[PDB]
Symmetry: C3
Subunit: 183 residues, 3 copies
Amino acid sequence: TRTLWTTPDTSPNCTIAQDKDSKLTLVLTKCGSQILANVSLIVVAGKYHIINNKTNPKIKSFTIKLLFNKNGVLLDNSNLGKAYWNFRSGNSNVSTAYEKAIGFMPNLVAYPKPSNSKKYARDIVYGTIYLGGKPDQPAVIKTTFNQETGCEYSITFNFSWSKTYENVEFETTSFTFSYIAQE
Amino acid sequence: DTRTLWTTPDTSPNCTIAQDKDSKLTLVLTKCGSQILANVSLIVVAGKYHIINNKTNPKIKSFTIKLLFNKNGVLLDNSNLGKAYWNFRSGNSNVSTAYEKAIGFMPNLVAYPKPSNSKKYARDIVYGTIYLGGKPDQPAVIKTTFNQETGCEYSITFNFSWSKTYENVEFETTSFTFSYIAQE
Amino acid sequence: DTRTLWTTPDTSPNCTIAQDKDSKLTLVLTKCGSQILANVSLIVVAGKYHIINNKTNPKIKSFTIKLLFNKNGVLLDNSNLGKAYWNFRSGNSNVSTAYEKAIGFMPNLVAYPKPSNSKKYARDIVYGTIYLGGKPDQPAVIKTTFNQETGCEYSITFNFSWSKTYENVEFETTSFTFSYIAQE
Ligand SMILES: [Zn+2]
Ligand SMILES: [Zn+2]
Ligand SMILES: [Zn+2]
């Protein structure tokens, strides 16, 4: 069945530190009870565009959050802009915002919201991507399901690095993962 | 849902590593035609592998969870995973009756042959790293091997191992995705 | 379209890295709508890359396998992979006739543009690590790049490289799974 995506162009669609400073490319394809996900990031401007940890040793991580309501609709506090997220139609999107995508949401039994109960690590997936496609420029992408407040479901991407990069543009290789679907 | 075989997504223990029901293996196998998309994680709740302390027990560095299947893809009871809640999905639960056939979910025997006298290829293994407690400095290796057990027609085995000296670290993991070639 | 397009899962050599038919590339592409789920491994059986010795040949550190496709997603004969056994799956074999169209299996050209004077973004690359002989201390990097070859409409290229100093180690790998955005 279907695919929810950001069209795979390079037009900025995401706000990390300043308005439209990045293009998140995210494709979610439903394969029954699992969602197959493919993600990459291009930071085009602003604080995170060029990393220089000699001049700014403190800049070592940032987060992009996707927050969804009970119908699986993206909420406006998300870093990703609402106009950019929809079911695929060709290399573009359907012309009208979708009303329902619960089949694409991370499963709440697998990945419960924060509560008074024990929190398990299975709601996280780690991966490594590479800045500029260079094998000696790893950064970690940590993806977490359903851990944000103010929403019914969430997918968050935390990008971090441990090396001292000097004038390295933050644009990444791609990473694939999956997660258990709500229905 | 006859495209997903799973353990259910709850946290009720279903697996016996060192003692009865000491762990929850969460395993979801989704059939995408000739490939099975697999998602796995592990929570150990009790016993020898629950709290790792390699200062006190320096030799506790690895363990294995085996799923063994018959010619029909039915789980055999000396697998570490219990039979009761390994089944086709129905909602967040399972279908009511135990399944009789799941050959479409078994690892392909031409791709991943049983042990024999013939050359053994590495393609029957997938390696991944998961993280204890979700902490990025607590890696452990998950090694998954297809059809290398005897006394069965098919098998999937998960070997968990680590090389750091962990001190009072609970063995509960992040999730890992992989795929394998299906028998049919 | 649920189909699988593959090399078949046997171990018969189908690929030419340094000399004719020196390797078996096992590649399985399954279409899951707008994404292709890919599973890959490599067995080198002869020639320069069969047994690696970096004490005697320290500069032998990488090689490349290219799949080049025309406008219809048909494999071009200058690819390293041979055309004879690359086809849609039928059982553990292939459909009898060579396929004529597989555009839905090609890497998306907007996501992964062909080479030009325009900025080359890294999103057209996926990196993974596989293990020689299934040994966890024998990593090698598999770098996969989409649509960066000339003389074709689409391409998938696999660059295998390593940084350890291997001494008489056979180049045969564990398996790796990735996905990519489909052209249609
Ligand atoms: Zn710039
Ligand atoms: Zn515990
Ligand atoms: Zn050999």
